[PDB]
Each structure stands twice: as C-alpha cells, then as structure tokens.
Amino acid sequence: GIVEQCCTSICSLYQLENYCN
Amino acid sequence: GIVEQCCTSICSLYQLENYCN
Amino acid sequence: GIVEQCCTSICSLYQLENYCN
Amino acid sequence: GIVEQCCTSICSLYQLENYCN
Amino acid sequence: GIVEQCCTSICSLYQLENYCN
Amino acid sequence: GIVEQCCTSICSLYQLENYCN
Amino acid sequence: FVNQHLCGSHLVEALYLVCGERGFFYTPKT
Amino acid sequence: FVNQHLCGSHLVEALYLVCGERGFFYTPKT
C-alpha cells in the first residue's frame, strides 16, 4: 500500500492526500 | 479528542495506545 | 517574509512553493 | 549496545527505558 | 540546567557542547 | 555538492556553514 | 514522574512510536 | 509539487502536513 510504495519507490503528495479523513 | 487529551492537557504513552488500530 | 506569512500568520503548501528555486 | 541494537536489529520501549535517569 | 540555559533563555551550539560526554 | 557529500560520505558543521546566507 | 504536552507533528510522531505496525488514526476534529 | 521518497516517521510527518485539520489514517501493511 501507500506506506510501502512511498518507502520502496516514490509517491506524490496527491497520492498521500487519499489517506486524509 | 486526542488534541484535548494530549496537547491541551497531558497524556501518557499508554493513553496514546487508545488511538492505535 | 516567509516567517510572517507562514509562522506568524498561516499559509498553505501552495504558498510555500513560492520559496522553491 | 542499545544504540546499535535498535538500529541494526529492533528494540522495545522497555529496553529503552533502561537509559532513563 | 540545560532547559534554563537553552530553552527558557537562548544558547549557542558551542554551549551545547558542555553536555557532551 | 554538499547535500550529496553529507549523505554519501560525512560532512562537518563548518562545511555546512558555507550555505548560510 | 509527570508527562508533557504533545502537539502538532510531535503528537503524530509519538503515535507512530507507540502504534507502529498496528497503524493509527489521527482525527483532531473528533 | 515534487515526488517524495518517505520512510518511517517521515511518512507520518508528510501526512500530517498534507492533511492538516482533516487528520489521516496510517495503515502500514503487516
């Protein structure tokens, strides 16, 4: 998931925004 | 909520465990 | 400057982009 | 010691507590 | 102590060296 | 440059001071 | 011993420390 | 914005800054 993608690869702030409430 | 308990007041690391999944 | 805009007042992540090179 | 064990392996908060004054 | 010197007052990085082992 | 040297190798605080305004 | 205030990003850092692999929710409006 | 490489507590810091008062869920794989 996102925690793993950001750490093993890269991720964008727009992808992170999907985890906001 | 958590801000009232831990920031405005003080809380322990044990009380933080209340917000784990 | 940045301290007046973002610390003393509040600013968004979009406004922070103003200080990128 | 603890600094090395936490970084090369894993450590618990209870093991860290031994370094408190 | 360190909190009085560096937090309540201000201190330099040189004064922090006083608390190294 | 400095960002890379500090991360791939090591750097001193005196070398960092050159990036201060 | 008495505890201290944990605010802003320091609060979420503490939740990360305590919950780790379990995950957590940070819901300041609640 | 730029892409990010974020591990550990750095990821929760980023979520905190992106989400603000909305809050977030942190859900690592186990």
Place this chain on the structure above:
Amino acid sequence: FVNQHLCGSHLVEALYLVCGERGFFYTPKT
C-alpha cells in the same frame, strides 16, 4: 479546511517536503 502555523524547524521541513529536488531558500530576515 483551514491551515496551521509552521515555525522554526517545522517550516524548513515543510519547504523540504514541497520543494525537494528543486531546492529552496530560507531567509527569515527578508
């Protein structure tokens, strides 16, 4: 949603997050 204050090292951490590879300047006297 409304934003929060970013001060001291938290401000520079946010600039790092937003600018990354582009670099940035932090000039508090300006």
Place this chain on the structure above:
Amino acid sequence: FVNQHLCGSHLVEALYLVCGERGFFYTPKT
C-alpha cells in the same frame, strides 16, 4: 507497545518520549 527500528536522531527522539522529565543518557559505541 510494539518493537522499534530506530537509527540516528530517531533513537534520541524515542528516548526523549520514553524518559520524559527523567532525562536520559545517550551512549553510542565508538
């Protein structure tokens, strides 16, 4: 609580949160 993988300044942050007003000693191997 969960087990932790902590390097560098992250370890001192964890000691700060665990120990609170008690304080701590940080003693890396050399």
Place this chain on the structure above:
Amino acid sequence: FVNQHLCGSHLVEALYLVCGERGFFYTPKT
C-alpha cells in the same frame, strides 16, 4: 547574529547534532 530557543525534542536533536559519537546526557531536572 543572535540565537533562538531550543525546547523539548528540538533540544535533544541539537545535542545529537553537536555531540554525535561522543554521546550526551539530557538531565532536565538538574
């Protein structure tokens, strides 16, 4: 130039930066 206040976890982060391998003690009750 004049210095700033270093409090809480930011103080211990600064001690880590300055002392590194030498180690340090953080004793707020002293």
Place this chain on the structure above:
Amino acid sequence: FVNQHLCGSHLVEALYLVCGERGFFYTPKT
C-alpha cells in the same frame, strides 16, 4: 563538534540549527 552523516530532511534540520537567523540555501544536485 563532530562529523555528521546527514540525508534527506535531517540535512535541512542541520542547516537550520547551524545557520539560525542567517538562513540558508538548500541546493541539491539534479
């Protein structure tokens, strides 16, 4: 002072503490 191994946001934190009110430029290679 001691030598430092500093990656990512840790480098910007160090620049913040070294430079203080002077500010700094963060200029990674691209």
